[PDB]
Design a binder for these strands. Structure first.
Ligand SMILES: [Mg+2]
Ligand SMILES: [Mg+2]
Ligand SMILES: [Mg+2]
Ligand SMILES: [Mg+2]
Ligand SMILES: [Mg+2]
Ligand SMILES: [Mg+2]
Ligand SMILES: [Mg+2]
Ligand SMILES: [Mg+2]
Ligand SMILES: [Mg+2]
Ligand SMILES: [Mg+2]
Ligand SMILES: [Mg+2]
Ligand SMILES: [Mg+2]
Ligand SMILES: [Mg+2]
Ligand SMILES: [Mg+2]
Ligand SMILES: [Mg+2]
Ligand SMILES: [Mg+2]
Ligand SMILES: [Mg+2]
Ligand SMILES: [Mg+2]
Ligand SMILES: [Mg+2]
Ligand SMILES: [Mg+2]
Ligand SMILES: [Mg+2]
Ligand SMILES: [Mg+2]
Ligand SMILES: [Mg+2]
Ligand SMILES: [Mg+2]
Ligand SMILES: [Mg+2]
Ligand SMILES: [Mg+2]
Ligand SMILES: [Mg+2]
Ligand SMILES: [Mg+2]
Ligand SMILES: [Mg+2]
Ligand SMILES: [Mg+2]
Ligand SMILES: [Mg+2]
Ligand SMILES: [Mg+2]
Ligand SMILES: [Mg+2]
Ligand SMILES: [Mg+2]
Ligand SMILES: [Mg+2]
Ligand SMILES: [Mg+2]
Ligand SMILES: [Mg+2]
Ligand SMILES: [Mg+2]
Ligand SMILES: [Mg+2]
Ligand SMILES: [Mg+2]
Ligand SMILES: [Mg+2]
Ligand SMILES: [Mg+2]
Ligand SMILES: [Mg+2]
Ligand SMILES: [Mg+2]
Ligand SMILES: [Mg+2]
Ligand SMILES: [Mg+2]
Ligand SMILES: [Mg+2]
Ligand SMILES: [Mg+2]
Ligand SMILES: [Mg+2]
Ligand SMILES: [Mg+2]
Ligand SMILES: [Mg+2]
Ligand SMILES: [Mg+2]
Ligand SMILES: [Mg+2]
Ligand SMILES: [Mg+2]
Ligand SMILES: [Mg+2]
Ligand SMILES: [Mg+2]
Ligand SMILES: [Mg+2]
Ligand SMILES: [Mg+2]
Ligand SMILES: [Mg+2]
Ligand SMILES: [Mg+2]
Ligand SMILES: [Mg+2]
Ligand SMILES: [Mg+2]
Ligand SMILES: [Mg+2]
Ligand SMILES: [Mg+2]
Ligand SMILES: [Mg+2]
Ligand SMILES: [Mg+2]
Ligand SMILES: [Mg+2]
Ligand SMILES: [Mg+2]
Ligand SMILES: [Mg+2]
Ligand SMILES: [Mg+2]
Ligand SMILES: [Mg+2]
Ligand SMILES: [Mg+2]
Ligand SMILES: [Mg+2]
Ligand SMILES: [Mg+2]
Ligand SMILES: [Mg+2]
Ligand SMILES: [Mg+2]
Ligand SMILES: [Mg+2]
Ligand SMILES: [Mg+2]
Ligand SMILES: [Mg+2]
Ligand SMILES: [Mg+2]
Ligand SMILES: [Mg+2]
Ligand SMILES: [Mg+2]
Ligand SMILES: [Mg+2]
Ligand SMILES: [Mg+2]
Ligand SMILES: [Mg+2]
Ligand SMILES: [Mg+2]
Ligand SMILES: [Mg+2]
Ligand SMILES: [Mg+2]
Ligand SMILES: [Mg+2]
Ligand SMILES: [Mg+2]
Ligand SMILES: [Mg+2]
Ligand SMILES: [Mg+2]
Ligand SMILES: [Mg+2]
Ligand SMILES: [Mg+2]
Ligand SMILES: [Mg+2]
Ligand SMILES: [Mg+2]
Ligand SMILES: [Mg+2]
Ligand SMILES: [Mg+2]
Ligand SMILES: [Mg+2]
Ligand SMILES: [Mg+2]
Ligand SMILES: [Mg+2]
Ligand SMILES: [Mg+2]
Ligand SMILES: [Mg+2]
Ligand SMILES: [Mg+2]
Ligand SMILES: [Mg+2]
Ligand SMILES: [Mg+2]
Ligand SMILES: [Mg+2]
Ligand SMILES: [Mg+2]
Ligand SMILES: [Mg+2]
Ligand SMILES: [Mg+2]
Ligand SMILES: [Mg+2]
Ligand SMILES: [Mg+2]
Ligand SMILES: [Mg+2]
Ligand SMILES: [Mg+2]
Ligand SMILES: [Mg+2]
Ligand SMILES: [Mg+2]
Ligand SMILES: [Mg+2]
Ligand SMILES: [Mg+2]
Ligand SMILES: [Mg+2]
Ligand SMILES: [Mg+2]
Ligand SMILES: [Mg+2]
Lengths: 151, 234, 138
RNA sequence: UAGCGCCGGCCAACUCCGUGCCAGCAGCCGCGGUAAUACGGAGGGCGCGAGCGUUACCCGGAUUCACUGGGCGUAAAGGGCGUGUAGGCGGCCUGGGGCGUCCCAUGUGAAAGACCACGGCUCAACCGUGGGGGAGCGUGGGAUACGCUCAGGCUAGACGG
RNA sequence: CUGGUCCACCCGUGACGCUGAGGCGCGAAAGCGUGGGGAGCAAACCGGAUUAGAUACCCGGGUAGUCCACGCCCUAAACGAUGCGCGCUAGGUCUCUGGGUCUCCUGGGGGCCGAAGCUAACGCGUUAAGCGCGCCGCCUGGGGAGUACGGCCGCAAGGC
């Protein structure tokens, strides 16, 4: 129902007497291009089944994202153990400038202006997971004063 | 009432197996055993029962869980006597988490309930009859109390949190509210509505479940008198 | 010997928040005060107050937190997510007003010493003064 | 007048013949051992166009010398261990100085150049005019919280009975 | 004869602290010098046996050495493969040592399991690999190599 877009479909494998069989990684992002977004990573002995499966998980794990005219509120750095990612706010006409992964994220996020970089590791998977969290830690001016109130 | 009653033979428990977090509830440590704060318990049941209450007046279904022996039947009785779902038997991976599939089994007990009362054993050799029926027995031996649940619980009552903590996780993830009796051997923070106090002895267990269910029934309609349990206490 | 009493305090607060204590104390000191005072005024802590441990001037610092969360790990969101000393003893930092940092695009604060006093990043610009960039907090 | 590079992957562009670890390609991974989208020719396609490719060197990517912005149990990395010189760093209270530091004022920071605006040559490159800021240092004035520094007090550090 | 460390009392000093390039001292074993000592053990060395061969594993024998004094050498899986100092951050249990009328507590040490958290994972976790600051040492693809040249030290082997 939202939008759909996969980042990669790798074929892993495994040993076993007489040969090797393979499952199939499949990372997919999904979003309404309007704040609601969710990432998903499915696995199965079939490419289609795999993407299909990533679809189910995608809409499950979701996250609202505080969009200021297509940009992000404040800048944030979030290290998912291995890799690390930066995210910066930018005026209209800047565009989504990032590696292929965080793009899928931010694009299907409804984001349209943002400076970013992948420092550290770069494993697509981990950078994925990383960004999700990062957005999941963005906070609107309200959230701030709302917590910083406690009336 | 709810005061001196619990204040009676239902307070304090355990020693040297405790989350320092649950310690905000302990009064002292006499005889080497943790003396839970009597008053603090009542204060809690207030907020709790207010949710217990509100939750019933909504008509919402509570899932009871107590696989621990010292409460196995003490759940059975109080839940049946409340039209609510319960599990005193062994819990299962996905009770709520993998619902649909666990439910396939409930349906299977319906299918088995057909032939368990139908003129269709003109067929079915004596052999098949044996196992097929034997199934039904344990089919009920784990589902009979869960089988009445058909939607998906609105909350979960738990005898001992740490013990059947697996449930708590299932529930918690599905954003299902947690309520439970819990001694010092417990993790106070991951319970949404806490019933601090003894939970290894029949005394506190029967007392809590009693008034708990009575509250459910009263918020509903037709309050009566507690089932056998005082003799069960012996 | 304790190197930097300031970094310590900041740290004491960070180490305490993570476990969600109600209040950690800290060795008292006039300059240390201001940090709290501001840190509190901006809404980062319910407050503070002088105390005394076995004949030692200290400071209770009543920590703030967010509401409970629903779902796995009902971990209450923090009120102080981030705190870090900038100018250390082994590297003093000094900034002109014409160049004072904006913490988390303004969501954040950047307390700093100055000739007029300890002031927020904004209050710095207010009275138009630069000084020793102490630390930032968000 | 229309040319040049490319069309296995990175990388935008696919078929056919020839060929057969040879002829050859190559920046990395690799490609050719009779059936090659990877050699070579053809048809077609992608890219740019009075150009297009190559070689060479500089900065980038390279947060791969990390101030911004990294590390050191096992991946490269804690000195064999101690005593200690130099240097580095330094707890709580008050006071004088004001070195560092912050502020203001002025001098300087040529022109050209960079950015903005507007005008000139049909446009443009190029050019004129005007505008702004600029690190840095010189003089003067001012603030004193943190650093320093002299001075005074304390006992939580360290030492001692 | 002498070094360190821990506890009680809160008596004295009054920030005298921390770290530490170079320097200096210590530094298993093997090894070197002069003199001594020599039971057992034992490189090398000899014989037996095994094997295709067996300069080895096994067996019989056996010298330096291993022991002491004095001197030199200065290397190591000198290993927790984790520099030191300080502050902070749940507990459970075992044990060594001290103080206290004590199933308890309070300190200093050595172990295991674990909060939070850190980690690439294994794992670490108030004996941190967590959170912080000071100071030193070290790293910057595998090979060539801890080699070569130079310099310094050493009787030499050889070390830096
Ligand atoms: Mg739609
Ligand atoms: Mg939709
Ligand atoms: Mg589709
Ligand atoms: Mg998963
Ligand atoms: Mg499905
Ligand atoms: Mg919202
Ligand atoms: Mg939002
Ligand atoms: Mg890392
Ligand atoms: Mg790569
Ligand atoms: Mg890689
Ligand atoms: Mg949000
Ligand atoms: Mg929000
Ligand atoms: Mg119902
Ligand atoms: Mg019948
Ligand atoms: Mg029949
Ligand atoms: Mg239900
Ligand atoms: Mg439901
Ligand atoms: Mg909590
Ligand atoms: Mg009986
Ligand atoms: Mg709290
Ligand atoms: Mg305010
Ligand atoms: Mg090209
Ligand atoms: Mg290209
Ligand atoms: Mg292509
Ligand atoms: Mg030929
Ligand atoms: Mg041929
Ligand atoms: Mg061919
Ligand atoms: Mg072939
Ligand atoms: Mg090619
Ligand atoms: Mg070709
Ligand atoms: Mg052509
Ligand atoms: Mg041209
Ligand atoms: Mg380069
Ligand atoms: Mg380079
Ligand atoms: Mg660089
Ligand atoms: Mg690195
Ligand atoms: Mg270190
Ligand atoms: Mg190297
Ligand atoms: Mg050392
Ligand atoms: Mg040394
Ligand atoms: Mg070493
Ligand atoms: Mg050495
Ligand atoms: Mg020392
Ligand atoms: Mg010194
Ligand atoms: Mg000082
Ligand atoms: Mg000094
Ligand atoms: Mg001083
Ligand atoms: Mg002064
Ligand atoms: Mg002066
Ligand atoms: Mg000026
Ligand atoms: Mg200049
Ligand atoms: Mg000037
Ligand atoms: Mg000028
Ligand atoms: Mg100029
Ligand atoms: Mg330039
Ligand atoms: Mg003009
Ligand atoms: Mg013009
Ligand atoms: Mg013309
Ligand atoms: Mg000009
Ligand atoms: Mg000008
Ligand atoms: Mg300039
Ligand atoms: Mg100027
Ligand atoms: Mg100057
Ligand atoms: Mg002064
Ligand atoms: Mg004097
Ligand atoms: Mg003094
Ligand atoms: Mg003392
Ligand atoms: Mg002695
Ligand atoms: Mg005396
Ligand atoms: Mg005195
Ligand atoms: Mg001093
Ligand atoms: Mg030696
Ligand atoms: Mg020797
Ligand atoms: Mg010799
Ligand atoms: Mg000798
Ligand atoms: Mg000789
Ligand atoms: Mg002689
Ligand atoms: Mg001799
Ligand atoms: Mg002999
Ligand atoms: Mg012998
Ligand atoms: Mg021999
Ligand atoms: Mg022999
Ligand atoms: Mg022979
Ligand atoms: Mg022989
Ligand atoms: Mg022998
Ligand atoms: Mg002797
Ligand atoms: Mg002798
Ligand atoms: Mg002698
Ligand atoms: Mg060191
Ligand atoms: Mg020392
Ligand atoms: Mg004792
Ligand atoms: Mg006592
Ligand atoms: Mg006593
Ligand atoms: Mg005493
Ligand atoms: Mg006793
Ligand atoms: Mg005991
Ligand atoms: Mg105790
Ligand atoms: Mg003891
Ligand atoms: Mg200990
Ligand atoms: Mg101990
Ligand atoms: Mg452990
Ligand atoms: Mg954990
Ligand atoms: Mg400790
Ligand atoms: Mg401690
Ligand atoms: Mg411990
Ligand atoms: Mg420590
Ligand atoms: Mg670590
Ligand atoms: Mg590590
Ligand atoms: Mg190298
Ligand atoms: Mg090389
Ligand atoms: Mg090399
Ligand atoms: Mg080497
Ligand atoms: Mg090398
Ligand atoms: Mg060597
Ligand atoms: Mg050498
Ligand atoms: Mg040379
Ligand atoms: Mg040479
Ligand atoms: Mg040499
Ligand atoms: Mg010589
Ligand atoms: Mg010799
Ligand atoms: Mg060495």
């Amino acid at each position: 129902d939202f939008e759909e877009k996969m980042i990669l479909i790798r074929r892993t494998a495994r040993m076993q007497a007489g040969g090797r069989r393979f499952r199939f990684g499949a990372l997919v992002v999904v979003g309404d291009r309007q704040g609601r977004v969710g990432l998903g990573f499915g696995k199965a002995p079939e490419v289609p089944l795999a993407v299909q499966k990533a679809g189910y998980y995608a809409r499950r794990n979701m996250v609202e994202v505080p969009l200021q005219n297509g940009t992000i509120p404040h800048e944030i750095e979030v290290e998912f153990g291995a890799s690390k990612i930066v995210l910066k706010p930018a005026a209209p006409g800047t565009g989504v400038i990032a590696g292929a992964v965080p793009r899928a994220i931010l694009e299907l996020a409804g984001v349209t202006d943002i400076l970013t970089k992948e420092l550290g590791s770069r494993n697509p998977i981990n950078i994925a997971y990383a960004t999700m969290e990062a957005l999941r830690q963005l906070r609107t001016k309200a959230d701030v004063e709302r917590l910083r109130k406690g009336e | 009432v709810k005061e001196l009653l619990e204040a009676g033979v239902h307070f304090g428990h355990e020693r040297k197996r405790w989350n320092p977090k649950f310690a905000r509830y302990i009064y002292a440590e006499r005889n080497g055993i943790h003396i839970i704060d009597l008053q603090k318990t009542m204060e809690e049941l207030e907020r709790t029962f207010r949710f217990i209450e509100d939750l019933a007046m909504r008509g919402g279904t509570i899932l009871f869980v107590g696989t621990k022996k010292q409460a196995q039947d003490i759940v059975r009785m109080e839940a049946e006597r409340a039209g609510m779902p319960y599990v005193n038997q062994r819990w299962l991976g996905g009770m709520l988490t993998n619902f649909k599939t666990i439910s396939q089994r409930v349906h299977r007990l319906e299918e088995l309930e057909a032939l368990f009362a139908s003129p269709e054993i003109e067929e079915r050799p004596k052999k098949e009859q044996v196992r097929l029926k034997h199934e039904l027995e344990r089919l009920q031996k784990y589902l009979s109390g869960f089988r009445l649940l058909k939607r998906l619980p609105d909350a979960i009552f738990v005898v001992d949190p740490t013990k059947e903590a697996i449930a708590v996780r299932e529930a918690r993830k599905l954003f299902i509210p947690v309520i439970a009796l819990a001694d010092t051997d417990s993790d106070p923070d991951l319970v949404d509505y806490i019933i601090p106090g003894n939970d290894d002895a029949i005394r506190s267990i029967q007392l809590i479940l009693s008034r708990a269910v009575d509250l459910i029934i009263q918020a509903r309609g037709g309050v009566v008198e507690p089932s056998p349990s005082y003799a069960l206490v012996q | 010997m304790l190197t930097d009493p300031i970094a310590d305090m900041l740290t004491r607060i960070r180490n305490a928040t993570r476990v969600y204590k109600e209040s950690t104390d800290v060795p008292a000191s006039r300059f240390k005060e201001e940090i709290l005072r501001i840190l509190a005024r901006e809404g980062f802590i319910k407050g503070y107050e002088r105390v005394d441990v076995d004949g030692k001037p200290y400071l209770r610092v009543y920590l703030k937190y967010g509401p409970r969360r629903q779902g796995p790990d009902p971990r209450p969101e923090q009120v102080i997510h981030h705190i870090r000393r900038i100018s250390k003893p082994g590297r003093r930092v000094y900034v002109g007003v014409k160049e004072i940092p904006r913490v988390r695009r303004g969501l954040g604060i950047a307390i700093l010493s100055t000739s007029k006093g300890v002031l927020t990043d904004r209050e710095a610009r207010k009275l138009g003064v630069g000084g020793e960039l102490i630390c930032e907090v968000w």
